[PDB]
Amino acid sequence: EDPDYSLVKALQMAQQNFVITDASLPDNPIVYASRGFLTLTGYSLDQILGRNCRFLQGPETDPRAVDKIRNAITKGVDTSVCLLNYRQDGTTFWNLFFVAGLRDSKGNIVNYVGVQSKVSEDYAKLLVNEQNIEY
Amino acid sequence: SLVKALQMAQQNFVITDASLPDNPIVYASRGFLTLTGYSLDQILGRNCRFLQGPETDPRAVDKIRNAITKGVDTSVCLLNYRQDGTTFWNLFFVAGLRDSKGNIVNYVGVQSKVSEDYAKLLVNEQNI
Ligand SMILES: Cc1cc2nc3c(=O)[nH]c(=O)nc-3n(C[C@H](O)[C@H](O)[C@H](O)COP(=O)(O)O)c2cc1C
Ligand SMILES: Cc1cc2nc3c(=O)[nH]c(=O)nc-3n(C[C@H](O)[C@H](O)[C@H](O)COP(=O)(O)O)c2cc1C
């Protein structure tokens, strides 16, 4: 009597840390960001707008994990990855990050919802060792 | 697979800021813009109640209002209006987006253009 919603389910596991991108626009730019995301990353909203989320990555980020995210996106499947991200001030944190494509009635991915979440060193070690099972 | 097997659309949605007085629109998908016939700027900063008109069931509007204050997720079938005056039945869903403390700071709203007979079914059921 009440629908399942990939978008709603995602945004509710997101504890006010999320973004929305527009896939129809060049390079999948951010078009909304929650206050939780602003305070987690350290960026202000205007700077965040119209930019691809890759700005959260830095020198130490695992390119292999970025590979998984790029690949998941091109293929239209939802996944989650744990990688090192960077705040506006240069401080780092491990990010268990989930992404889901939103499609129109004709099956075309039109928007993306990203969900970020800081995790402990311990949880991250666990998460990364699982992700590395692929290799 | 009765109320969700064919309510499958997710391109029509809006996000409102509940921390601002009249729970105004802060974002709206292009699918929404196309459905309702509005441009994004006009939509922004306004409450969504502009979709309602003379023939919209007040009792259904109530079931929404109450679900929002109480912060519970609900689906409501409504008669809505496009900017050009034309109507459509909206199987509409609201959910509160809470932070790590359980506070609602945002709301997602997903709208679904539905058929005549499906809406009659949804409406007959709502009357209980
Ligand atoms: C909605 C959405 C949210 C994203 N959030 C993050 C994120 O929080 N951290 C991150 O490192 N990458 C994130 N990404 C991935 C980057 O935006 C980008 O797709 C990725 O770095 C691979 O693309 P590239 O090789 O062009 O950099 C997100 C992508 C999308 C679509
Ligand atoms: C995120 C969100 C989306 C909404 N979308 C619609 C909609 O598409 N159609 C509609 O009739 N009401 C919609 N509403 C309901 C109105 O915005 C408002 O909550 C409702 O009219 C009850 O409040 P009121 O008694 O002041 O009118 C939405 C509300 C929220 C919070």
Side-chain angles (χ1 to χ4, degrees):
Chain A
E1 243 281 356
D2 228 69
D4 185 317
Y5 267 131
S6 165
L7 169 63
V8 179
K9 215 277 134 51
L11 296 174
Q12 290 180 313
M13 60 115 74
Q15 294 178 303
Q16 271 301 321
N17 302 330
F18 65 89
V19 300
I20 310 281
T21 68
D22 194 330
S24 70
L25 285 179
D27 199 29
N28 207 194
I30 297 178
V31 289
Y32 180 91
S34 56
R35 72 159 77 149
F37 176 93
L38 297 187
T39 68
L40 164 80
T41 56
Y43 291 94
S44 93
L45 160 77
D46 298 334
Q47 5 187 288
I48 278 186
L49 289 164
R51 297 181 66 190
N52 184 279
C53 295
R54 72 174 58 89
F55 66 80
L56 294 174
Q57 299 158 12
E60 209 161 350
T61 313
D62 190 350
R64 195 173 258 183
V66 175
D67 295 331
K68 183 197 180 66
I69 299 172
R70 184 165 55 253
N71 154 85
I73 284 180
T74 108
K75 288 191 204 298
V77 19
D78 305 340
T79 55
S80 53
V81 190
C82 185
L83 41 35
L84 197 63
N85 279 175
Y86 289 66
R87 293 189 187 88
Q88 189 263 26
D89 66 351
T91 50
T92 69
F93 71 101
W94 284 89
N95 183 9
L96 178 47
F97 144 73
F98 174 84
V99 55
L102 311 173
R103 299 158 188 274
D104 53 32
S105 64
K106 292 205 275 62
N108 295 123
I109 285 175
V110 96
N111 285 113
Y112 280 94
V113 52
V115 177
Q116 299 73 21
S117 64
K118 182 208 316 170
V119 294
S120 63
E121 207 85 1
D122 311 284
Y123 194 23
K125 296 182 178 178
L126 199 75
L127 293 174
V128 165
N129 285 146
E130 269 297 310
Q131 283 167 22
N132 292 0
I133 253 51
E134 278 196 55
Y135 321 100
Chain B
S1 63
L2 302 156
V3 189
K4 24 81 169 181
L6 254 171
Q7 186 196 5
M8 284 195 283
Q10 274 195 143
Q11 78 270 33
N12 304 337
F13 65 97
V14 298
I15 299 180
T16 67
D17 187 6
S19 297
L20 305 182
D22 198 30
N23 200 170
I25 295 170
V26 297
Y27 175 78
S29 60
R30 302 201 170 186
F32 179 92
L33 302 181
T34 306
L35 166 66
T36 59
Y38 290 90
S39 306
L40 200 249
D41 51 348
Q42 4 187 216
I43 282 215
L44 285 172
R46 307 176 56 192
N47 184 277
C48 297
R49 76 173 58 91
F50 60 76
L51 294 155
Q52 296 149 23
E55 288 196 284
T56 298
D57 194 340
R59 253 186 47 250
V61 166
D62 305 339
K63 287 173 176 53
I64 287 175
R65 174 178 60 251
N66 181 233
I68 292 174
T69 52
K70 305 264 175 68
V72 323
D73 310 328
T74 38
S75 303
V76 187
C77 198
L78 277 172
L79 183 74
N80 284 163
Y81 295 67
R82 297 182 185 84
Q83 174 163 351
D84 71 350
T86 56
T87 69
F88 65 95
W89 287 101
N90 190 344
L91 177 53
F92 153 77
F93 178 85
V94 261
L97 302 181
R98 303 168 186 261
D99 61 8
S100 58
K101 252 176 173 143
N103 310 92
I104 297 179
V105 352
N106 283 126
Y107 284 100
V108 231
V110 177
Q111 299 82 11
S112 298
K113 186 176 188 281
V114 294
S115 78
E116 295 261 273
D117 47 335
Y118 189 37
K120 257 294 139 299
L121 209 51
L122 292 163
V123 151
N124 282 3
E125 197 58 28
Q126 284 174 145
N127 302 345
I128 266 131

